[PDB]
Amino acid sequence: SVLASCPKKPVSSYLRFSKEQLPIFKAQNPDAKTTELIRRIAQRWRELPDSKKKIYQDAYRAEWQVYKEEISRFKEQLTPSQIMSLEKEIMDKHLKRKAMTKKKELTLLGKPKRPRSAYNVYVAERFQEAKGDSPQEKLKTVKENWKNLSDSEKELYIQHAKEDETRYHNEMKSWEEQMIEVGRKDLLRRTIK
Amino acid sequence: SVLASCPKKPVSSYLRFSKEQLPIFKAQNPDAKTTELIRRIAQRWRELPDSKKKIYQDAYRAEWQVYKEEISRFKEQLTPSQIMSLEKEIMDKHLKRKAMTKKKELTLLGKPKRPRSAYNVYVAERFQEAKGDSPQEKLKTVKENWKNLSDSEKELYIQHAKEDETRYHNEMKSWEEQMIEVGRKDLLRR
DNA sequence: TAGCCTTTCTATTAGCTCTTAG
DNA sequence: CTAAGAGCTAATAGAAAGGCTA
DNA sequence: TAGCCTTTCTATTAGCTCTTAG
DNA sequence: CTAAGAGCTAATAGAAAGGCTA
Numbered sequence A: 001s002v003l004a005s006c007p008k009k010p011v012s013s014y015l016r017f018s019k020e021q022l023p024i025f026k027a028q029n030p031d032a033k034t035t036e037l038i039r040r041i042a043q044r045w046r047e048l049p050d051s052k053k054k055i056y057q058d059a060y061r062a063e064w065q066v067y068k069e070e071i072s073r074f075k076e077q078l079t080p081s082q083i084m085s086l087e088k089e090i091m092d093k094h095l096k097r098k099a100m101t102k103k104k105e106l107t108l109l110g111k112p113k114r115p116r117s118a119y120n121v122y123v124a125e126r127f128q129e130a131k132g133d134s135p136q137e138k139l140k141t142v143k144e145n146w147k148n149l150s151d152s153e154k155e156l157y158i159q160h161a162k163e164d165e166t167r168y169h170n171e172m173k174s175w176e177e178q179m180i181e182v183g184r185k186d187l188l189r190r191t192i193k
Numbered sequence B: 001s002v003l004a005s006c007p008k009k010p011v012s013s014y015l016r017f018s019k020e021q022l023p024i025f026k027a028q029n030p031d032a033k034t035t036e037l038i039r040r041i042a043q044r045w046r047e048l049p050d051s052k053k054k055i056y057q058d059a060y061r062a063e064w065q066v067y068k069e070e071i072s073r074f075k076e077q078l079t080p081s082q083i084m085s086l087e088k089e090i091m092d093k094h095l096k097r098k099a100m101t102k103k104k105e106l107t108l109l110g111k112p113k114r115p116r117s118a119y120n121v122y123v124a125e126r127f128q129e130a131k132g133d134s135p136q137e138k139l140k141t142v143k144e145n146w147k148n149l150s151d152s153e154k155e156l157y158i159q160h161a162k163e164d165e166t167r168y169h170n171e172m173k174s175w176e177e178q179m180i181e182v183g184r185k186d187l188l189r190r
Numbered sequence C, E: 001t002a003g004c005c006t007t008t009c010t011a012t013t014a015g016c017t018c019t020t021a022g
Numbered sequence D, F: 001c002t003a004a005g006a007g008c009t010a011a012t013a014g015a016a017a018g019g020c021t022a
Helices: A013-028 A034-047 A050-076 A080-108 A118-125 A135-148 A151-182 B013-028 B034-047 B050-076 B080-108 B118-126 B135-147 B151-181
Strands: none
Touching: A013 A034, A013 A050, A080 B080, A118 A135, A118 A151, B013 B034, B013 B050, B118 B135, B118 B151
């Protein structure tokens, strides 16, 4: 909202060169992978005489002066409420990226899944059965069927949950022992129940 | 600040008991550490019959109903801009506490100071020799007498700024390798 | 992976005093 | 949706010098 | 320790494409 | 300013089950 309209900074000298060069490298080798092309483009950059790098550097510097003007005139026409909104939007985006980065990191470190309750075991064992033309409606259905379960049957899912609590404690003790060894004592629970 | 005026949540039963008891314990033991009074207060709570703990829980539950009412009519009267401000204030507070906790932790772990710049070394030695009514107004004198400095005079301080850059690299490889010992690779640069 | 739907759980964190020290 | 990968440039945040008041 | 003042530095992270896969 | 310490209670955030579309 405020962030959407905020002037964006110009790209540096090399990234400018990189974006005219990529489509020509791609058009000549449409099968070769983008990581190989960028790897091939970087050196066209290293090899490029400094008289030619200066053409890209001069454009960057000239656009940097447009940016300074654009951003100064932008920030100074914002109301206090729009300044707060811009700061909250930037903060929220940064936190979304940090949270997402941490989840990918913990998956690479092989963090155990948390205990799956009897309802979670139910949703796994009997979801695609549930009538629904949308995954959200197949779940909406699962919630009613879960309630309609006989007491006899729900105790079957409670024991599956019970034995998964044991799996959680075992795997966590093992994973947390491994994190101290990898030097990630920070990833440990402070309150281990 | 929207958060300043926001109804706060009631304290749980033990903290209600703890409140009335601390003055009594303090008055009876005035040379005792607050940490020891709270330890003895928790002991009284543990010993307290559940019929008496329920008196404090019933008050909590009754105050929880007052809270729900107060917070809903407070938030209903907030403009969209005040709702966004309240949410930003809550998050900023949480992050200020996280950042502050990390700085205290790194000070206990004895993290090396970063490299002092030539300006930094000029402020340290020539600060109290500068005219100024307030510490901010003393720094303006040093900032003005830094700008005016000769290149040869700058080199005298630039002598410390280069030997301190060595001190930083040395102390950091020592501290970072010690942080691997304690199992805190997360605190390294990388 | 996030977010949609509901339900359910674990781990975290909020609250309070009063002194010390960051 | 968007981070990762494959590169480079450089703006950015925050720490650092001092001390006094939150 | 944060934040006030200015200046200065180090470490981080932003930018770009296009495909893959989280 | 406020975290730490010395305790307890419980609200809260976010993960978990599934799959499909950002």
